Design a protein around this ligand. Structure first.
Ligand SMILES: COCCCOc1ccnc(C[S@@](=O)c2nc3ccccc3[nH]2)c1C
Ligand SMILES: [Mg+2]
Length: 180
């Protein structure tokens, strides 16, 4: 059975957007970072290591606005033990109606593929936002490309992507804009 429960009533009419974490919304690292947005302690084989998390610019405006426009789902290749605490801390608005992690990805030809068909949502109303063209090899026509973000604090891509999602949020069939 499908990766998601049935949409709640607030969410059923909306387009479902699958959103990536790392290098899409945040960039985390084991190397200490000086003025970090948050620091997550992560237990790895019994030893706690600090993870230094930087937020991509305009991520707050971005997530609060997508949480309105869409049934937003976090879908990352990372492990819950790291991604859940990052989410609790980023997601100030209850934007993510679900969280999917490494076990929900398909490992295909050495890549973590987000298989939109296991989602349980009509595919004409599913979008995937990911820095990584491989996570959507199976659904290239459901995808909004975004560049990988590491630390460039002049980045404006989340802000610049918003009027396009504003338009997508209203169509009956995303393929009518993307093209399948
Ligand atoms: C001591 O290093 C061993 C790493 C074990 O993996 C873990 C475990 C917990 N947390 C993290 C933090 S995160 O930066 C991260 N992003 C990733 C993207 C792809 C694959 C693994 C990833 N891991 C990682 C990478
Ligand atoms: Mg990524």
């Amino acid at each position: 059975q499908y990766l998601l429960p049935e949409a709640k009533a607030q969410d059923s009419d909306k387009i479902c957007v699958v959103i990536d974490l790392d290098e899409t919304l945040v960039h985390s690292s084991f190397k200490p970072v000086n003025n970090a947005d948050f620091i997550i302690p992560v237990e790895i084989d019994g030893v706690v290591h600090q993870v230094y998390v930087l937020k991509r610019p305009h991520v707050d405006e971005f997530l609060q606005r997508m949480g309105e426009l869409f049934e937003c789902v976090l879908f990352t290749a990372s492990l819950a033990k790291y991604a859940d605490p990052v989410a609790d801390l980023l997601d100030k608005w209850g934007a993510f109606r679900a969280r999917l992690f490494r076990e929900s990805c398909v490992f295909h030809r050495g890549n973590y593929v987000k298989d939109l068909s296991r989602l349980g949502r009509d595919l004409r109303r599913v979008l995937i936002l990911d820095n990584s063209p491989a996570s959507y090899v199976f659904h290239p026509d459901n995808a909004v490309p975004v560049a990988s973000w590491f630390d460039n604090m002049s980045d404006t891509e989340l802000h610049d992507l918003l009027p396009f999602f504003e338009q997508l949020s209203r169509v009956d069939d995303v393929y009518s804009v993307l093209r399948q």
